[PDB]
Design an enzyme around this catalytic site. Structure first.
Site, short mmCIF file in Angstrom:
data_model
loop_
_atom_site.label_atom_id
_atom_site.label_comp_id
_atom_site.label_asym_id
_atom_site.label_seq_id
_atom_site.Cartn_x
_atom_site.Cartn_y
_atom_site.Cartn_z
N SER B 139 -6.54 9.25 -5.32
CA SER B 139 -5.75 9.98 -6.44
C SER B 139 -6.75 11.03 -6.80
O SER B 139 -8.31 10.88 -6.72
CB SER B 139 -5.35 9.27 -7.44
OG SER B 139 -4.89 9.95 -8.66
N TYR B 152 -6.12 2.63 -13.52
CA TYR B 152 -5.50 3.09 -12.11
C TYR B 152 -6.60 3.92 -11.55
O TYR B 152 -6.92 3.73 -10.35
CB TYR B 152 -4.30 4.05 -12.32
CG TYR B 152 -3.74 4.68 -11.22
CD1 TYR B 152 -3.00 4.06 -10.14
CD2 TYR B 152 -3.99 6.07 -11.11
CE1 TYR B 152 -2.47 4.59 -9.22
CE2 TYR B 152 -3.61 6.65 -10.01
CZ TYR B 152 -2.72 5.88 -8.95
OH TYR B 152 -2.15 6.67 -7.82
N1 NAP Z 1 3.12 9.91 -7.02
C1 NAP Z 1 2.23 10.22 -7.49
O1 NAP Z 1 2.07 11.30 -8.04
C2 NAP Z 1 0.71 9.75 -6.79
C3 NAP Z 1 -0.32 10.38 -7.12
C4 NAP Z 1 -1.56 9.84 -6.59
C5 NAP Z 1 -1.59 8.82 -5.69
N2 NAP Z 1 -0.33 8.20 -5.49
C6 NAP Z 1 -0.45 7.17 -4.53
O2 NAP Z 1 0.36 7.08 -3.41
C7 NAP Z 1 0.81 5.91 -2.89
C8 NAP Z 1 2.29 6.15 -2.95
O3 NAP Z 1 2.85 6.48 -4.18
P1 NAP Z 1 4.42 6.66 -4.50
O4 NAP Z 1 4.31 7.47 -5.88
O5 NAP Z 1 4.98 7.20 -3.29
O6 NAP Z 1 4.85 5.13 -4.81
P2 NAP Z 1 6.17 4.82 -4.85
O7 NAP Z 1 7.39 5.45 -4.54
O8 NAP Z 1 6.47 3.92 -6.20
O9 NAP Z 1 6.49 3.71 -3.26
C9 NAP Z 1 5.51 2.51 -3.92
C10 NAP Z 1 5.48 2.04 -2.11
O10 NAP Z 1 4.29 0.99 -2.10
C11 NAP Z 1 4.99 -0.29 -1.66
N3 NAP Z 1 4.48 -1.31 -2.44
C12 NAP Z 1 3.96 -1.55 -3.68
N4 NAP Z 1 3.40 -2.77 -3.93
C13 NAP Z 1 3.32 -3.28 -2.76
C14 NAP Z 1 2.88 -4.56 -2.01
N5 NAP Z 1 2.32 -5.43 -3.28
N6 NAP Z 1 2.67 -4.74 -0.92
C15 NAP Z 1 3.38 -3.86 0.06
N7 NAP Z 1 3.82 -2.65 -0.41
C16 NAP Z 1 3.78 -2.30 -1.61
C17 NAP Z 1 6.33 -0.19 -2.00
O11 NAP Z 1 7.14 -0.97 -1.19
P3 NAP Z 1 8.64 -1.98 -1.60
O12 NAP Z 1 8.77 -1.45 -3.14
O13 NAP Z 1 9.48 -1.68 -0.76
O14 NAP Z 1 7.94 -3.21 -1.47
C18 NAP Z 1 6.58 1.33 -1.72
O15 NAP Z 1 6.77 1.83 -0.25
C19 NAP Z 1 0.26 4.94 -3.72
O16 NAP Z 1 -1.18 4.31 -3.53
C20 NAP Z 1 -0.03 5.86 -5.41
O17 NAP Z 1 -0.83 5.14 -6.04
C21 NAP Z 1 0.65 8.52 -5.95
#
Ligand code: NAP
Ligand code: NAP
Lengths: 248, 248
Positions: B139, B152
């Site tokens: 991030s 985070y």
């Molecule tokens: N959104 C942003 O702006 C942003 C910015 C920087 C970084 N990120 C990072 O990018 C990644 C994806 O983010 P997103 O916003 O796309 O997230 P999201 O839409 O909330 O999706 C979360 C994903 O993580 C999986 N997950 C969560 N906990 C888990 C666990 N304990 N074991 C296995 N799978 C798990 C979920 O699977 P299920 O729920 O189906 O089990 C889902 O596929 C994350 O690492 C997040 O921190 C996001």
């Protein structure tokens, strides 16, 4: 109908491979040399691509010529999608105390001022259409201290400064501006120094964690990634292409 | 036969778009969820690609299950070309002094340990064939201080540490290990948080110099670039996908 890219260079080393990479991706490519005699090589260096290549004689240290050449390109093609600031020199002497000021000035002129001039005039046109990509070439020496390459490194640090500053300034105008930071790349120049025995390949390869040299294709691919139309959100960034060098 | 990628996720947000990107590039894709019931969504989410998708139920905080799932994948497909550590959570409260240790431990467990477990077991296999790529998701908060996202941010800093450390350790074994550092990405989750009215889009997009949010495709494209077979020389690198955020 094709996207249009200007590369400062294109006849040898990284620049030639950058030209090839954009050509393989359906761009019209403007390439340059200081030497008009190089134009006749085109059909032979770029066999099947001749019709999609335009030659311009250009010394990037000549600000008036940079403005003229970029104006000519914009007039002829009505677009300038990408600028690749490839032109650069390395005049390596010994330790800092033994370096020549004339050498430093030459590197400043080409590596800093040349990149600045090309950015300055490219951005005047890109501003009007609120789109475009610039990719500058720095070095690992642009992000770390490298004995015997201090002055070259200083210029490559300066290139990063121009990159990040311009990026922030033009970010809201939809223009992407990034740099690549290559490690040691096996160009034609290096290959012959290896072939002449007075340079061991494994000797210089060992400075990279991956224990191999970079290729011109490694660099061309990174440049293409930062330049292409699918880059909507990467700007101000320096992409290391260095076999892990900067991560240790 | 096809190159094989494992994504920790695939049903929502960035993970779904990453699956789609690898599918469009002729990979067989293993996608996961903690919830077995998600498997039946596959023909509907991924209409034309169903034949090239395999579902595995996985909680990345469960080291035993990570080892089991990776072993099962390698047994069945006989290869593991790419691992994408997508799974991650953000549990924002207030200032540091008000934060809950239980929230910190949850983020540590998923974001740090989950990424570590998947790396650990993926590398035992990739080590054997001296090839493979890992892309971790950090991030902008992994490279800067971000009020209200300190905890985070700390886990995403740790992700970069795992990335750089493993890159240097496995560089001579032909394996590439990199990370992406996204800015604020408009996922389904965020799209509806704007729809509720608790956030304006222009309000939060203003933190990026580009004055817009990132998309899941932006992130997927960066991840694909770092993971693909044409990456021979990029390792230990953190690719910012942040509309210029970290260049200021
Ligand atoms: N959104 C942003 O702006 C942003 C910015 C920087 C970084 N990120 C990072 O990018 C990644 C994806 O983010 P997103 O916003 O796309 O997230 P999201 O839409 O909330 O999706 C979360 C994903 O993580 C999986 N997950 C969560 N906990 C888990 C666990 N304990 N074991 C296995 N799978 C798990 C979920 O699977 P299920 O729920 O189906 O089990 C889902 O596929 C994350 O690492 C997040 O921190 C996001
Ligand atoms: N080789 C490496 O390991 C390495 C590592 C990191 C960064 N870099 C950087 O990558 C870039 C390309 O390096 P390279 O090794 O591919 O270089 P190279 O093979 O020596 O070729 C130099 C190119 O720059 C052009 N050039 C030089 N001075 C110029 C000037 N004053 N005006 C216009 N064009 C000029 C040359 O054109 P003409 O001679 O035809 O006029 C030629 O196309 C440079 O910026 C370099 O510093 C190289």
């Amino acid at each position: 109908m094709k996207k249009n890219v200007l590369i400062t260079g294109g006849f040898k080393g990284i620049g030639k491979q950058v030209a090839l990479e954009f050509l393989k991706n359906d761009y019209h490519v403007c390439i340059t040399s200081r030497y008009f005699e190089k134009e006749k090589r085109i059909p032979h260096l770029f066999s099947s691509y001749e019709e999609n290549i335009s030659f311009y004689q250009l010394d990037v240290t000549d600000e008036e010529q940079v403005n003229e050449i970029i104006n000519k390109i914009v007039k002829k093609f009505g677009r300038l999608d990408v600028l690749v600031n490839n032109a650069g020199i390395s005049l390596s002497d010994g330790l800092l105390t033994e370096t020549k000021t004339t050498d430093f000035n030459k590197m400043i002129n080409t590596n800093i001022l040349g990149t600045y001039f090309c950015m300055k005039y490219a951005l005047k046109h890109m501003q009007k259409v609120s789109c475009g990509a610039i990719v500058n070439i720095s070095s690992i020496t642009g992000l770390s201290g490298f004995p015997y390459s201090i002055l070259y490194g200083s210029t490559k640090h300066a290139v990063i400064g121009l990159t990040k500053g311009a990026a922030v300034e033009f970010a809201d105008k939809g223009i992407k501006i990034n740099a690549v930071a290559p490690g040691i790349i096996k160009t034609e120049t290096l290959q012959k120094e290896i072939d002449s025995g007075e340079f061991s390949e494994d000797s210089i390869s060992s400075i990279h964690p991956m224990q191999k040299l970079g290729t011109t294709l490694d660099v061309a691919k990174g440049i293409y990634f930062l330049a292409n139309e699918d880059n909507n959100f990467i700007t101000g960034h320096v992409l290391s292409i260095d076999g892990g060098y900067l991560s240790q």
